[PDB]
């Protein structure tokens, strides 16, 4: 069987409501063998609802499962930052005639909190990086919402490669992200330029953090 | 009380084989449930692989794509294995063991392990380099660069310092090696403690407040 969910992402402000849809290619077992799971990075699926609409033990009543047969909904009322997560439907069928269980592909929930401008820091390569032949410059944008864009500029020239970005999940207290952006260069290329700039844009706000190679 | 723990996940060559174990604690295999495996590839959702009935049947069930290369067995009253063959990079994932409750008891019997990570790669384990992160000559940090396989752990001051700590998700480079950063925003010296179990690596790096 195949289970198809809403879309990859949905959003709502603290206190608002999210709707996540799940369609099964064939009727789940007895029309209600359908579970909802929450998942945060690094953890196994955490059961929210089973039998289509029954709240698992200790789960908050602002999670609501509905539907029957092939069409199901999860509704999250009063969204909190702690609901920032991916949500999966899982259908159940007779093992002897179909897949025992089938997961949908997931719907992420993005929870819109109070906006916070990023705290931006740039970190020159430690001296002992250079000896390795490669150097990694690290920029972080800490505690921010909504999403930002990072640009690297080396002696004013926008960088397009050597860059890796890594964003934390939304903080469960305040909905904020943290972002680490790294520019990797050979030691010789690194030592061919003077100024390294990390420019972080949130909306029309720009934070620029820079260093000159020689000042380190 | 009742728990599952997956083991056996490792770095493994393309074309090679690996056996994973799911170990039950707090109970033994009786009946009225199945023990199943799922996997979840990085930035993807979990997908079903196989189930085995806990009762006398020992009936086994497999996703279409899996029945070639995967074998699910009960190897004791508390262990179920997943043997995986002809592995390719497509098989890199966290593998989870699950207890599937019969209808009427799905919620009651639902139990998951924390997962075991399987890394299908041609390279050999590699220890990270750990480099201090500090402002050009306060937020300080450690860059944990160039390790394989996952995971690493990073603590600060032996774990006593957790407020103001931001450890970022690892990223896998084109080399196939991983990197990750941790930073800590402090106002009395700070030391990152980095471990890479796979290579027996433990590194403490006390981060000076500038370069």
């Amino acid at each position: 069987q195949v289970l198809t969910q809403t879309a990859s992402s949905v959003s709502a402000a603290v206190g608002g409501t999210v709707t996540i849809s799940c369609q099964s290619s064939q009727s789940v077992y007895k029309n209600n063998y359908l579970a909802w799971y929450q998942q945060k990075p690094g953890q196994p699926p955490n059961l929210l609802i089973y039998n289509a609409s029954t709240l698992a033990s200790g789960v908050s009543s602002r999670f609501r499962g509905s539907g029957s047969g092939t069409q199901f909904t999860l509704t999250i009322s009063g969204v909190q930052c702690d609901d920032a997560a991916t949500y999966y439907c899982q259908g159940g069928f007779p093992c002897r005639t179909a897949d025992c269980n089938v997961f949908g592909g997931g719907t992420e929930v993005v929870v819109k909190g109070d906006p916070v401008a990023p705290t931006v820091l740039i970190f020159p390569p430690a001296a002992d990086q250079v000896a390795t032949g490669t150097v990694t410059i690290v920029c972080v944008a800490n505690k921010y919402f909504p999403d930002v864009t990072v640009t690297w500029e080396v002696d004013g020239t926008t960088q397009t490669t050597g860059i890796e970005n890594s964003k934390t999940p939304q903080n469960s207290a305040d909905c904020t992200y943290n972002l680490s952006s790294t520019l990797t260069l050979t030691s010789t290329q690194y030592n061919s330029h003077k100024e390294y700039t990390c420019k972080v844009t949130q909306g029309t706000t720009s934070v620029v953090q820079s260093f000159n190679r020689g000042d380190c | 009380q009742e728990q599952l723990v997956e083991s056996g996940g490792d770095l493994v060559k393309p074309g090679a084989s690996l056996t994973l174990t799911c170990t039950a604690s707090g109970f033994s295999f009786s009946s009225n449930y199945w023990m199943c495996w799922f996997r979840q590839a990085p930035g993807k959702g979990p997908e079903w692989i196989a189930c085995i009935y806990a009762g006398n049947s020992g009936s086994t069930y497999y996703a279409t794509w899996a029945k070639g290369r995967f074998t699910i067995s009960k190897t004791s009253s508390t262990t179920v294995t997943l043997q995986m063959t002809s592995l390719t990079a497509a098989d890199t994932a966290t593998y989870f063991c699950w207890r599937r409750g019969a209808y009427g008891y799905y919620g009651d019997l639902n139990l998951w392990g924390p997962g075991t990570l399987v890394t299908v790669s041609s390279g050999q384990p590699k220890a990270p380099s750990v480099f201090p992160l500090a402002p050009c000559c306060v937020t300080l940090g450690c860059l944990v660069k160039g390790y394989l396989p996952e995971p690493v752990t990073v603590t600060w001051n032996s774990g006593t310092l957790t407020n103001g700590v931001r450890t970022f998700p690892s990223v896998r480079q084109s080399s196939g090696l991983y990197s990750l950063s941790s930073v800590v925003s402090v106002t009395p010296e700070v030391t990152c403690n980095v471990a890479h179990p796979a290579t027996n690596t433990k590194v403490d790096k006390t981060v000076a407040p500038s370069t």
């Binding site: 077992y29 007895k30 159940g92 069928f93 002897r96 | 009935y53 009762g55 019969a102 209808y103």
Partner: peptide
């Protein structure tokens, strides 16, 4: 008896 599901 292995249940149907």
């Amino acid at each position: 008896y292995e249940p149907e599901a």
